[PDB]
């Protein structure tokens, strides 16, 4: 409990960003001379963050580009100000011996050229040096200088290595805070070249905000929120921070642009990674968002990361787009349709290859996203897996320096999640152990599977994988119980021929569900209808699965005790229409599992193609958080259907390997 | 006036009772033969003879003046003689018409094989014996009789001492002539009013031979309430009610008497037995004609009834009219069960299913035939009644069509009934019923044309013909006609036109929507299109939402396989309910579910319906279509259940609205366009009177 409050106070205090200080950008800001050093606290930061091998940068992850480039950039500060020559050469040793990332081949050449303007014994004569110094010109050539001055671009992030540019038409391109694409390095060098006080103002605040020392990117108010939400959400503890999450999710909605989302509010250049993350979470949490904001990253069928700079697209952004395409609504622009296909192909061509590199388990995160589309993504399934995939402090981010995200790439995030999940597994085992008794002492295993522990186990598991909450135990057990009766009864009819020869008064049977003073009567009425559905759908070809599901949501709605006001006309329609979809969607599923007869891949792929279709209009009506039906009622429909889909799209082998991994393979 | 005629039928319906039936000369003169109880020499009921004298027909016959039947005139005519002569009074008129028997007796040989009177072959030979005794000049040696005489004896072979005297049979109706019977075991058999199978005649013979004063009360009861004179069967409290309802219902004017009908329909529910129904409350032998009528009308009017009472009349594969006795089945009783078999619910005992199958076949063997005469009724247009129910099953039976047709089929005062004598039922087979129904129907047609011109104007004024059907002129006509054939009432104009308008708009938009391929290529908004349908401001809020919801359904069901015909049906019923401004006030959980299910079934039925009408002209296969026809028919039963079960908490009017919309979709899919406008012509344009 203390931990939840820990994450809460961290989220309530959300802001510009929790980022690690970058050694390179801090010393490059140290290089700015008094307006009459200008930030002696940049230097005061520098002296202390020296690693024992005499080097700099990220300590916990050793990277060549990072330890070298961060180390020397601190050196070019200490010696060019002729102070602390003790550590200055002590780290000059590190550079010499280990001489054998973003903007690396642009900021490093201007940093050696800057190393020449001082004296510093460093192997410039490196065979590795010529290969990346050649790419200096291999890129400064494909960049059109007259285009770098016309529209804000990703290049403006590396102006320390840029030579002889028109600042008259460049200051027109900065971010809203005055920064040059949010690099303090690019703004320091832009200030050495022009004294724009709004371009200074970005810099001083960044050092004031950190009491010395400055990161490699700022601010990142959007990226951080979006990703902190997705992370808490996947970890299953999102329910604890509902006001805080909906607090900053609002912020993302406020700053939605028709051109997409950037990593910060005040960056005019947008990227697909942030837009897809934003689009998914905004739609997932019930906001009105239009996916057409994506066609800004489509150029002739292909999907890049920036609007124009057709760079090679990385792996993580395509994952995040693929996920956003999974919340496809039928009324949406086709761009989301095209996006799904492209991103699936991108990640499939790469799945069978270790070319999944960009974080702890990025292939596992991706296998899931591809093997379990939305219709079959049960939140506890994803969450159990995600505990074994979330990197914690292990995740590192590739910027100008190696940097880390304090707020959402946290170790407290895991300790909290694995706690809340263990208590779920504990509450789950006691839950079913109580269920097993209930099943047996009812002469109820005589009906059902030829191994009723298996028909019980999956029937309880589905309900708990979806309605997993602490207190919602009333509903969960109700779902499991009613499910078992329905399975039992369907089994009895299947090997007897129908209610035609129902010798018994099997209406009763609900009295196997314990009497609640508010629950029992209405549950009798719903169960009566499921029976009445059998005798009518009996001597025909329509399946009953549609009505089995419809009964379920009816009970789950009786437990948990919310009713649908029926005087209001649109309240009636939205409910009555949700039932139609669930009745229709589960009936089509039961037709696919019959064609798996077992022949015609062409025919099965037709049924799948249209179930996905009807699922979209359901997913729309369930998430559309303005609809006149209670969000919990809407979730109840989504829960039942997803579980039905889950079952219909999964081998019994895969299904209980999940059961073992979520309920029994204890975390912590 | 129209109001008076409705009041005429009404005040008569309030005064319903034991029967309004016509007097029988035969049953009456047989009661004059009963000598005074107080040991006096005047006949016990002198008012029977008072009646005799007054109604001798001009040819000296007796019986039905308006309908001449030989069998009818002989038995009623001589029975009056064997009365008048047996008291040796009025021998002057006794003779005039004694010759009628003399001259026309030979003609007994011509009668229509099919409709011979009841107990004719038992009660007429019994009447030679009473004439022989009074010694009358009669052709007892008529060769025409030998055929009925000796086929009495073989008729009178199914008499056993053991069965006639242990459990009641219909022979008890005609024991006027019967020898060597043991009344001690026979009185244990009669009906509750004391009659012998409700025959005043048979009860008189049972009185000459048994002084049973608790059975006399029955005869005195008839003679007081009919002021002398006596019907050929009494009482008819169940039959008369059942038939008055079916007639007023098919004549389309049931609604004016909703209270009156629901009164005596209650009278039937109270007296429903697991053995079936008879024509009276107090007759232990039940018959399929009354039992079938009661079941249908009861289930039609929202009563809980179980068809399993029908297997009381199933005798291994066949459907007779009585429980014990297996007899040649007549036409009207099979028609009336067949009509009842149309209301099968999916929960029913199977016998109602099988009966449908039998009488369909029974009536088919007979449709292509001279045989269509009934043994029970002689009605103006009896095959037309059978035509419709045979061609138009429940799902496609629109109430205004049936009623239009029935107006030219109801015989009115012309219908005559076959008992021991020809008798008539004045109450529900009269001319005021027809005069009234045609009135209520003409005022329906007049208002129909007036509305039509409003539709024609409205369709124009909205420019919606730009993309109607091919000829929007008939897509208008039919879409009004479907709505008017169903919601036809006086007041309901609000809903009807709204139905027609919303149907036209919806179809119009769907037409254009197909033209271009979906909203993907739609430059237009269309959301505000309903403002083309007139509407009060204290209503526009919900009609917009229903339409917006329908469009959302379009965008979903596009580039998919499911049709929208379901959702257009939902849209209509949703719209009609808005125009009638009733919503489901606030119900418990099963109220919501029950509504949600009607929407489900309606949408599901109409998709399945529009799945055959494209697989019609496409990949034929009679068996592939019977798969769809089966699948639609099933859903209809569960829906027909959910509409008609009058215990439900959803308003009657909401449920009926679902049936109207679905029935109209059915009518269209199952009707040749050639026939469909013949109906349109006949109900809206081919005016009655």
């Amino acid at each position: 409990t203390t931990m939840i409050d820990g994450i809460r106070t961290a989220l309530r205090s959300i802001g510009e960003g929790e980022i690690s200080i970058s050694a390179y950008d801090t010393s490059l800001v140290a290089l700015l001379k008094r307006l009459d050093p200008q930030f002696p606290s940049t230097i005061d930061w520098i002296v202390q963050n020296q690693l024992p091998d005499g080097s700099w940068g990220d300590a916990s992850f050793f990277m060549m580009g990072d330890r070298i480039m961060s180390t020397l950039a601190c050196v070019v500060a200490l010696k060019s100000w002729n102070i602390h020559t003790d550590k200055c050469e002590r780290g000059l040793l590190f550079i010499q011996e280990n001489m054998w990332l973003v903007g690396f081949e642009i900021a490093l050449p201007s940093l050696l050229d800057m190393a020449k303007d001082l004296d510093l014994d460093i192997p410039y004569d490196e065979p590795a040096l010529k290969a990346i110094y050649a790419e200096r010109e291999r890129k400064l050539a494909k960049i059109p200088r007259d285009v770098l001055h016309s529209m804000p671009t990703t290049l403006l992030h590396s102006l320390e290595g840029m030579v002889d540019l028109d600042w008259e038409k460049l200051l027109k391109l900065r971010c809203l805070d005055g920064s040059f694409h949010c690099s303090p390095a690019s703004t320091a060098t832009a200030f050495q070249q022009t004294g724009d006080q709004k371009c200074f103002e970005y810099l001083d605040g960044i050092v004031k905000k950190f009491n010395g020392g400055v990161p490699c990117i700022y601010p990142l108010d959007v990226y951080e929120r979006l990703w902190a939400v997705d992370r808490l959400t996947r970890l299953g503890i999102s329910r604890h921070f509902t006001s805080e999450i909906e607090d900053c999710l609002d912020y993302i909605f406020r700053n939605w642009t028709p051109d997409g989302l950037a990593h910060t509010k005040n960056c005019p250049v947008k990227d697909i990674d942030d837009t897809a993350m934003g689009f998914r979470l905004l739609r997932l949490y019930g906001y009105q968002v239009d996916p057409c904001v994506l066609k800004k990253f489509e150029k002739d069928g292909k999907f890049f990361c920036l609007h124009g700079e057709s760079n090679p697209s990385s792996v993580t952004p395509m994952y995040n787009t693929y996920r956003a395409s999974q919340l496809k609504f039928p009324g949406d622009d086709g761009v989301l349709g095209r996006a799904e296909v492209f991103c699936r192909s991108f990640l499939q061509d790469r799945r069978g290859s270790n070319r999944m590199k960009d974080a702890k388990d990025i292939p596992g995160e991706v296998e899931y996203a591809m093997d379990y589309p939305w219709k079959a993504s049960l939140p506890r399934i994803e969450t159990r897996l995600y505990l074994d995939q979330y990197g914690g402090s292990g995740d590192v981010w590739i910027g100008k320096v190696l940097h880390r995200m304090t707020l959402f790439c946290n170790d407290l995030y895991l300790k909290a999640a694995k706690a809340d999940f263990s208590n779920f597994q504990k509450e789950c085992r006691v839950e079913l152990n109580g269920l097993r008794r209930w099943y047996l002492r009812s002469n109820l295993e005589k009906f059902g599977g030829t191994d009723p522990q298996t028909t019980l186990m999956t029937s309880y598991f589905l309900a708990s994988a979806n309605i997993f909450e602490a207190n919602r135990a009333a509903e969960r057990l109700g779902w499991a119980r009613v499910a078992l009766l329905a399975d039992a009864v369907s089994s009895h009819f299947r090997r007897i021929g129908g209610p035609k020869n129902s010798t018994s008064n099997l209406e009763e049977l609900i009295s196997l569900v314990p009497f609640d003073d508010a629950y029992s009567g209405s549950l009798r009425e719903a169960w009566k209808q499921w029976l009445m559905a059998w005798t009518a759908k009996e001597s025909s070809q329509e399946s009953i699965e549609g009505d089995t599901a419809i009964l379920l949501v009816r009970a789950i709605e009786i437990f948990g005790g919310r009713h649908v006001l029926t005087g209001q006309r649109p309240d009636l329609w939205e409910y009555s229409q949700l039932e139609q979809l669930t009745s229709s969607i589960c009936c089509k599923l039961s037709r696919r599992v019959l064609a798996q007869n077992g022949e015609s891949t062409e025919k099965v792929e037709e049924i799948d193609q249209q179930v996905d279709l009807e699922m979209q209009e359901l997913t729309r009506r369930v998430l559309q958080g303005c609809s006149a039906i209670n969000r919990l009622t809407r979730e109840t429909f989504l829960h039942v259907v997803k579980s039905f889909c889950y079952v219909a799209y999964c081998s019994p082998e895969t299904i209980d390997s999940h059961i073992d991994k979520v309920i029994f393979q204890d975390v912590i």
Side-chain angles (χ1 to χ4, degrees), chain A residues 72-105:
Chain A
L72 84 85
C74 277
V75 184
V76 181
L78 285 167
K79 169 61 204 294
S80 100
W81 259 226
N82 204 278
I83 87 164
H84 283 97
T85 40
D86 179 300
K87 323 292 180 183
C88 209
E89 103 285 349
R90 170 190 169 206
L92 192 44
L93 169 143
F94 177 81
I95 304 148
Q96 294 190 76
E97 45 84 52
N98 270 282
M99 198 45 178
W100 55 285
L101 202 293
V102 177
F104 194 53
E105 310 105 336

Side-chain angles (χ1 to χ4, degrees), chain A residues 412-432:
Chain A
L412 170 72
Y413 276 29
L414 257 206
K415 192 159 164 66
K418 275 180 165 162
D420 180 69
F421 204 95
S422 199
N423 291 8
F424 163 78
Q425 298 174 312
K426 292 146 185 173
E427 180 68 15
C428 263
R429 299 161 177 157
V430 301
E431 211 86 328
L432 40 72

Side-chain angles (χ1 to χ4, degrees), chain A residues 21 64 95 102 229 307 392 404 423 456 487 495 533 663:
Chain A
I21 312 104
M64 212 38 75
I95 304 148
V102 177
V229 173
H307 176 17
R404 304 239 170 79
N423 291 8
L456 165 141
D487 161 72
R495 295 150 320 96
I663 304 197

Side-chain angles (χ1 to χ4, degrees), chain A residues 109-359:
Chain A
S110 165
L111 191 48
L112 300 178
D113 292 329
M114 193 150 111
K116 280 187 129 196
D117 275 16
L118 302 85
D119 229 5
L120 40 60
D121 188 8
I122 45 157
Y124 295 75
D125 309 316
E126 179 71 9
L129 199 296
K130 261 198 179 79
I132 69 169
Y133 226 128
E135 181 143 15
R136 197 226 198 223
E137 298 281 17
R138 209 180 289 153
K139 244 142 51 183
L140 255 57
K142 274 223 312 293
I143 70 105
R145 255 181 100 252
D146 53 357
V147 182
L148 185 155
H149 292 50
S150 48
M151 264 309 260
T153 67
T154 206
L155 274 36
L156 283 55
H157 198 70
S158 281
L159 287 187
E160 320 99 275
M162 277 301 168
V163 48
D164 293 335
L165 44 80
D166 182 15
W167 293 104
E168 157 90 334
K169 214 142 270 282
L170 214 60
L171 284 174
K172 309 188 156 168
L173 279 61
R174 292 162 308 171
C175 294
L176 165 51
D177 48 16
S179 60
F180 272 96
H181 200 282
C182 301
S183 176
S186 269
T187 299
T189 302
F191 192 58
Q192 288 297 10
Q193 213 98 42
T194 187
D196 198 76
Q197 65 173 24
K198 185 53 206 162
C199 198
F200 168 75
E201 282 285 337
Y202 165 82
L203 291 187
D204 84 307
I206 220 164
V207 186
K208 301 255 173 58
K209 173 64 199 309
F210 286 134
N211 297 89
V214 66
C216 64
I217 177 175
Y218 219 74
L220 53 156
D221 36 45
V222 164
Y223 176 97
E224 188 183 43
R225 285 169 218 251
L226 280 183
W227 282 62
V229 173
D230 167 34
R231 295 296 150 92
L232 295 177
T233 286
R234 280 215 224 86
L235 289 177
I237 72 176
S238 37
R239 59 190 230 274
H240 296 266
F241 321 106
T242 38
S243 81
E244 303 76 2
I245 293 171
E246 81 185 9
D247 263 355
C248 44
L249 264 189
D250 289 343
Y251 175 84
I252 282 66
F253 197 86
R254 263 128 64 187
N255 298 275
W256 188 258
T257 84
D259 282 351
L261 289 187
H263 59 67
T264 193
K265 163 200 80 176
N266 41 28
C267 185
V269 49
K270 270 43 179 174
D271 68 299
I272 221 169
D273 196 22
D274 282 302
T275 291
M277 199 68 122
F279 172 87
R280 194 183 55 93
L281 295 192
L282 277 184
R283 191 199 289 307
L284 190 52
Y285 279 69
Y287 296 75
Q288 153 70 358
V289 278
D290 194 323
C292 74
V293 86
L294 260 44
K295 66 194 187 186
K296 284 294 194 276
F297 308 81
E298 206 193 327
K299 334 164 152 63
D300 58 61
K302 306 191 54 172
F303 265 132
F304 296 101
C305 292
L306 310 106
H307 176 17
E309 279 144 334
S310 310
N311 272 68
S313 300
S314 193
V315 188
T316 36
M318 306 300 288
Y319 169 76
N320 272 330
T321 37
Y322 180 53
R323 288 188 301 160
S325 80
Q326 294 273 235
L327 300 193
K328 181 174 31 205
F329 291 175
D332 276 343
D333 190 318
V335 316
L336 195 66
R338 295 176 287 270
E340 183 181 351
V341 178
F342 187 118
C343 309
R344 198 163 39 191
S345 285
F346 182 121
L347 298 175
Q348 257 296 130
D349 298 349
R350 204 148 325 193
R351 181 136 82 110
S353 302
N354 69 348
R355 311 189 275 117
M356 288 287 251
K357 295 231 194 340
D358 198 53

Side-chain angles (χ1 to χ4, degrees), chain A residues 585-598:
Chain A
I585 287 176
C586 289
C587 272
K588 276 66 160 298
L589 261 72
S590 154
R591 177 181 321 160
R592 171 201 146 110
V593 200
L594 283 199
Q596 287 269 41
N597 53 54

